[PDB]
Amino acid sequence: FVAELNNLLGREVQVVLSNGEVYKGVLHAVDNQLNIVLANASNKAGEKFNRVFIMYRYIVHIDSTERRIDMREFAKQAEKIFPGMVKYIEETNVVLIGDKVRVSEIGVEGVGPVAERAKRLFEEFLK
Amino acid sequence: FVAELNNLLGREVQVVLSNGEVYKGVLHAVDNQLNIVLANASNKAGEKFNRVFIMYRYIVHIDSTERRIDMREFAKQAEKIFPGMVKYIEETNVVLIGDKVRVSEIGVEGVGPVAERAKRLFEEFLK
Amino acid sequence: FVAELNNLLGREVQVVLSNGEVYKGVLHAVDNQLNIVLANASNKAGEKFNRVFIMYRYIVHIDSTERRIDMREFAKQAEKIFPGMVKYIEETNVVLIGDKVRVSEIGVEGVGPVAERAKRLFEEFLK
Amino acid sequence: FVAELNNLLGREVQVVLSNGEVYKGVLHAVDNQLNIVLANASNKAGEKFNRVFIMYRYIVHIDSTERRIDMREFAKQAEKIFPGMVKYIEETNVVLIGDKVRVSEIGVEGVGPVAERAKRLFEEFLKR
Amino acid sequence: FVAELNNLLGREVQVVLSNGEVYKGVLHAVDNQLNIVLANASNKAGEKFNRVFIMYRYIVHIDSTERRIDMREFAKQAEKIFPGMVKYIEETNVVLIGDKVRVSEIGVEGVGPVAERAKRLFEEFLK
Amino acid sequence: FVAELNNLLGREVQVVLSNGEVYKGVLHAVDNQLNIVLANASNKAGEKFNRVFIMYRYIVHIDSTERRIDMREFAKQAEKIFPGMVKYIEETNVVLIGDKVRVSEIGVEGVGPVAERAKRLFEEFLKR
Amino acid sequence: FVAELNNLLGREVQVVLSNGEVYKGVLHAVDNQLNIVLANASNKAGEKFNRVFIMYRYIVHIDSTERRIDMREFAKQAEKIFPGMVKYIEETNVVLIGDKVRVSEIGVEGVGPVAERAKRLFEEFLK
Amino acid sequence: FVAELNNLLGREVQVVLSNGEVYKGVLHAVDNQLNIVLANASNKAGEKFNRVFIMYRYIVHIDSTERRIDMREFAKQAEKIFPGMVKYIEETNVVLIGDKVRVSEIGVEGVGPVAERAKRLFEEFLKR
Amino acid sequence: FVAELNNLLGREVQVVLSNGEVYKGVLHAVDNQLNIVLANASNKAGEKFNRVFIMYRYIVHIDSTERRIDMREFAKQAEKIFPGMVKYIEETNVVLIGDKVRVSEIGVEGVGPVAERAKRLFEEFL
Amino acid sequence: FVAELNNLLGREVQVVLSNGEVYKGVLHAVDNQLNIVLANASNKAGEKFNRVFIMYRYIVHIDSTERRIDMREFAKQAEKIFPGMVKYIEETNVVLIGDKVRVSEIGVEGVGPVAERAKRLFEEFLKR
Amino acid sequence: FVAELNNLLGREVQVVLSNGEVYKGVLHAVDNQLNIVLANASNKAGEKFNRVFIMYRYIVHIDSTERRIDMREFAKQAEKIFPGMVKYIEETNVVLIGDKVRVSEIGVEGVGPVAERAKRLFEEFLK
Amino acid sequence: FVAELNNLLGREVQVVLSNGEVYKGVLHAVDNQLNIVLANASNKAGEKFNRVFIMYRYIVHIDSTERRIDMREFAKQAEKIFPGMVKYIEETNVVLIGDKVRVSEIGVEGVGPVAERAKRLFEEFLK
Amino acid sequence: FVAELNNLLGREVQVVLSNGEVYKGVLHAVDNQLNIVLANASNKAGEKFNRVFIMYRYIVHIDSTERRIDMREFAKQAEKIFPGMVKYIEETNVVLIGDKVRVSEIGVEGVGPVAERAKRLFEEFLKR
Amino acid sequence: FVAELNNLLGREVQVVLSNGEVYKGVLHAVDNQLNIVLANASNKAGEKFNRVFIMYRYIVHIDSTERRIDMREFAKQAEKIFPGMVKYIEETNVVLIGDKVRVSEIGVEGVGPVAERAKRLFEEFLKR
């Protein structure tokens, strides 16, 4: 889940370690090996650090109490519904469905059958 | 068992970790290395999280208390009974036996010896 | 992609090996390590084998061998089955039948006798 | 596929190696790592060896060498043994014997003396 | 022992884990890496689960209290006594020794010295 | 670069393999180990496949296939949509529109209607 | 996080080990495998050592309470804002943006919109 | 197959390497990683070395170099030694001696004088 | 020690696991990765199992209280004393030294200097 | 050498791959595994790509492509900015400027107005 | 830190193991995997051993209370000050800077500007 | 330290395991992966075993109380003193220095400055 | 075979590499991973290097290059030193000196003046 | 051989890679995994780079490029520097100065001023 964690950069998360400690802080960096860097983090003992560099071998799991919106995931779901018609545009963080429908994190822009199936997907997706 | 778990996506499962914690939630994603992502999960202390990202190295086992029919598994089993005549169709989630027998999650469709043998097999498949 | 492949059991795939051989046959089994078993396969020299067990270390890539269904044709044949209720939306290459059934090149959306009849039509194309 | 290969012990297989050699012989042993031992194997140059211990790292693929049984001929021979009790079903290429025995190109289903006799017939096709 | 475990598919086994849990259930699946799936399993705390997917890293040992004839093993033992004349036949679960003796899980069938030597071997084999 | 590649989902990429083949197609999926799935991909011999599942051990490199947008042209067109508001800055190859919307070859900064209309022009260049 | 740590060479850090010890000292050396050498480091019991060579397998996490500026990190995020016009200059530890704006750990030097934009980024960078 | 090779210490074996070389010599040592030491070994170019230490990573396969014993010839010679007590059995290519000794191409079953004499004839055949 | 353990097949051994359990049974199977299968085994709590399939990663050590003659071992040793003249014959479990001296589990058969040196070696071996 | 390469972000480099290709472009990113992202890179056939994601397993070596600054020419241009305060030292190929500013081919040592001004001159050599 | 430990061969060090033992002794050997041999070692309980061979997998960290001069590290630092002009000479354990300046653990030999810069570096190195 | 342990074959050593057991016995065999076989060993509880086969993953360290002479190690030391003139002779366990000096475990044979230097070397080696 | 190799320190070996090169020289160092350092080594092209540090991953095999001592010649020369006390024994290719010293192609067994002297003759052959 | 290479920092070495390239340059850095950085290196084609970062997986071997110092010539020069104090000992190719200082092709043994002077003569021989 490197991709999903990349969507949480800048958001608060909790990382539970095999030595029993739990650090909560802003997700600062994630790499392919799942090493993690937290910013302005703290542990249960209430200790605070500008940065905590966490070795991936000791990470049990990472928790988020935040529902955020990931348009790449929406694009994955949209491909199942409009196969061959979906493009994620990292430049504007939008998902294009054909060349007349545009989905952003606020919703679907466009008209007709496609746009209505899309609106329906987006709504499911938001839940 | 990446395949088996993929059939449980969207269903509730329980994941027991080596640090003694147990998470229960909706199986949200599974990769080839078996890292797991649960949605709306909780541990035994009652804490809840929108997402829990579980590193595969600390997962002891994953448990399910649900039946859940897997037509790919039925296809594998049918292949042993009707060698060379079995095809799984992911598009409609059905299994074709020969040119005239069709088996969906609700059962066998067809007539004759083949259909009777498939019906016996489908029934035992549901254990 | 163990899960995506497992969804192709019984379908014909091509496996390109790093020794330059190319084997085409029915996908019989895939494991977590991506070892692959092909049933009734053949190589470029035209030799045929009932079963081929492929070590994952030598697999360069696996390719789909079937063209997706022609949705304009699907609409053509479907209009005859559901007169006055078929529509082909060129915008997303999708076919709508009535107002509760939707067909894309990867499947049939909806439930009911029309949904069901459309899955049989779709499967017929696949054969 | 350790399990599937273990089910072929004593059967003839072909093993393609990444140095271009190809050995055909009786599958003698398979281990978890997929190291393979063949008995009375030979290569394309015609050299013959009582045993060949093949390192898993150089195995590209292992292939079956036997063709599946001709079910119509099986049906013909079963007919002589169970007069009037045999039915060939083209729809799946299966042969039915009486009301309790079913034979596919992969084996005999059923129990009892007819099933036992059918297995024996099946095996006679494999020895050829 | 992937091959031995395969001979126990559908049979009840006990799996002792590193975390101290012990699950008993029907051996439903085993792969090359020795991950294990039990069906209808229960632990020492009495909980029952339809499926338990156990990660190989945490399995200490697998135990069986049943005697289960494995004709593949008999074939291996026969090969040391009748070198070059043995063949396990998966299609019927029989071991052929030479051209005229056949051995099933019920015992030896045949006539002569070969049958006699095989009879003694099968008796030793049963214990 | 799992995260960077995930950001190209649905865009066309080129994947060069160690056996000499090169597959061009839309990135359909990328996992942590960098196995890649391409959709409607084709190779140099011209063969096309609806899906190509590429094993990570054999991937040498993955290349972007799209050229970046010509900012000078973007500027020209933004003007005939935002007269007297467009300014192309050579110093950074950036185009400014009004006083609160900035556009580079990888995005538009800003909020509000002018920022939104600009993302749409950007998207139009991307579509072709 | 080999890169981030490298920026902390000469600075005081705390390294938490899986045997329960915690060493605080100057980060003297870090390699690609994340082995770490600390200088004049002490553990909680109060023992100090001129050098402590810590094996990466036993490192849970590294923590820093300082806010050290990394012009490399500034250059990475400057590249997201001025794609293709950002160069980090190890020789003088400065980031060049175009041919007339230059950012040091002190701040932005240059004028016009580029300078202004950079000033906004550098200032944010300082959080 | 470390156990199997360890049973060939002192016997002549052929080791095919991924660089194209083939060394045949006496198996001197095998470890669990299947590194192999041959003594008095030679390659195809005819070079001979008193010891060759082969790294497991480059080993493709290891082959037996001896043919199994001619059992009909063994029976002919056991017959001179045990008048009217020897019988070759073609069904399994085994030689029976008296009622308590049995010889396959892999060894002798039985205990006592006849068995011990049978083992020495077998060995004489291996030394040829 | 895959080869030494193979010599103990069919013999009783003890396997100590890192979870603290200790199983005692007949060594039934051992593979190159040192996974071990025990037959008729039992643990310190008295529980009996027809088969115990032990994963190599949890095995600390394996113990044997029996002295068991391994002729391949004698062959390794004989090779140091009679370089180039030694061969282990698996077919008969015998070690041949030169072509007139034969050593089995019960001893040296042959005459002359070679046989005398082999007897001394075999005696030491046991 | 993850740290050494991270210090080269934004600078031009060349990456040689075991498939024989060679890409030259601006170092865009380097991870702990030594996977490399090059921006605006081109291979030896002249093809160009906005981004090339290179898998570490296939990288033979990475080479710096810029020549170090010519220190004789640096002292020359520097005398013009710092009249009578510049000394070129043949012994170590270093340039002294005044009494507290030192310049080698890898940087400027010193602090204050002269040091600042000489870093900007060093930088201009690197810009061209 | 294989290089650094080699500089400590023949000097006293302590090695802390993950089973809780601590051995103090003369560093006798270090290999690339960081296995370690100690001569005339002792543990906290006071037992003494001529040799203690320590498996690298169990070493948490190695510590030294001695300040040991390593001319190779001086050569590393000097190379940053006199790029392209530095050479470590193992035959004499000296660092040549240019053609007229020589540095030993005794000090800098030579005259001129280079020698003076080298002397500040050395006095600093001995910090 | 496979080489150093080989020199101890036949000598008593102690092996400390991560489960806390300690075995003392004759070093019977050691392989490249450092698996160890002990002959006639005993543990702290006083149980004795003909053979103890110790998996390398569980070995923390191996200890020896004997001072044993390793002529190969002396050869490695002599090569630093007599570069290019040293040869270890496994056949007779001696070290040849040049053509006229021979060193066995009871000392130096030879006359002249080479013999004198080798004697100082050997005396130290013994310490 | 780290232990067997460590017993050849100072002796000449040949190392065959997967890139096709072959280096022959004095075995200088060997570690647990079987990396090898050779002293005064040369390849087939005739180049010589004072030290060659060989990465284990590329080593196909290592071969001793010294032939074993001709024992008949050893016996001949031992007869000039121990008149009438030497017997060459063709049976095992061993040389007996008196009744307490025995010499094989790999060593001398025995204690005392005769044994010590035979060890020096043995070494004189190894030095040739 | 991490430690042995770290002792060659600043010295010239040759690194042979498995893609067939051979780089010669100053050893700038070596890490525990044997990744290697060369400074001002060149390949056989004559291309040179101020820095080359070589990936350990492609390094076949690293070779010393300097010849050891001529000890006879060293002696002939230690003479005009230490009249009547120098003896060249052929038996080990060693040079003795006075009776407390000893030089081998690997370095100087001894302490005090005669030793220091010896070390500097030794370095003059090494320098070019």
Ligand code: NA
């Ligand atoms: Na539980």
Ligand code: NA
């Ligand atoms: Na015990």
